[PDB]
């Protein structure tokens, strides 16, 4: 979690020291093996050669399957940040276009209407319920800071992905140049290279024994994280968001309880009073002025945009895109990077096991 000091931390790192010891005895294992061949056949070679093979097939494969699993986590972030993205920019577009909205409809009463001064009532009744308007989408959830914290994850899991591609196909070459270096000096009369790259593959053994290590304590951490992870997920990030909305997000496979239909139906019937009274000054402005004339059917035209607008805002608040989005990145996250990871710790007792073989087939040599 966040502190550096609790049980699960705790517990991760017992799990880490326990390969670490399981390790120890291999190499105390090892050096016994040794120094009893120093006190006082091809098929035992030949199956540890198929099994490094077989160690190092079912390795690439678990990465690529890890890799995989990322990539479409991070897919699914960037689905999310677009969502989000799309609501806030039209969130925000209404709400600036309904500024400039009253701003011009003050504009162009106050160059006509105000000659007469009859229709003050309901220019002051658009005025209440346009601000009413305002206040009701103001109750909105804006999604800055979700955009921002998911990018910033984003950013991270693709270093991170980045890195752990890296280093573990520096692994696998390390592995195959080993493995040749093994097939070279077993052709070729043995060098003073064979004795120089004895130390070589009992690092790499080292090096696959910690990674046995850290991929347990990966695979035990992750798999309880989201085993149920939307105790978590609310812990973390539901602090500014009430927890009814977090839960409707997480869980919506039915209609729960959607507590916004009211919001949706009183902007739909604040729009159908503004055509109404659009449509009046439209009829009372059969004897004035055709300036006034085109400015109403260029507001009605922009109430058609905004209803629009409206309606694509409805679709995007409806839960069932975001609710994909999550249950693709939880299958993603636990049914394919545990499995690829737990195919990565295979890799890794398998690799332990070739090493220990080619140690056992060492000092026969000479
Ligand atoms: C979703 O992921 C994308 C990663 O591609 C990021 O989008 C950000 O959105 C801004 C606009 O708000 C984008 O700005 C773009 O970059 C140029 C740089 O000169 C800018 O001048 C333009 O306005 C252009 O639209 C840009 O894609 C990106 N901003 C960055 C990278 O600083 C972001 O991670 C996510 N989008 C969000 C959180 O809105
Ligand atoms: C903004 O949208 C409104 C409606 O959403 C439109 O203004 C006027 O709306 C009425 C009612 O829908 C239209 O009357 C109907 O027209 C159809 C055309 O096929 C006709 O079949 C019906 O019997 C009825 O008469 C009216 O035509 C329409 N105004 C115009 C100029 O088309 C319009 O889409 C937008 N208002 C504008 C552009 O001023």
Redesign the pocket.
Known sequence: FSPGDETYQESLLFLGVLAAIGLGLNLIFLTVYLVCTCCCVTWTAVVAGLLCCAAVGVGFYGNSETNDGMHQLIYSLDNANHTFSGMDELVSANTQRMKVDLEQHLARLSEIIAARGDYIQTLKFMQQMAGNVVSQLSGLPVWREVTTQLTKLSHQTAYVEYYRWLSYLLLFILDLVICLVTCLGLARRSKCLLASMLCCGILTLILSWASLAADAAAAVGTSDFCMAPDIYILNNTGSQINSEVTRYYLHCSQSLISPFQQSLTTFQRSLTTM?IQVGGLLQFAVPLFPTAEKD???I??L??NS?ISLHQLTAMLDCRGLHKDYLDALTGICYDGIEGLLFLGLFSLLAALAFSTLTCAGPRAW
Do not use: V
Request: no cysteine; glycine share 12%; proline share 0%.
């Open positions: 055509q109403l059917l260029g009605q035209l109430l058609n209803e």
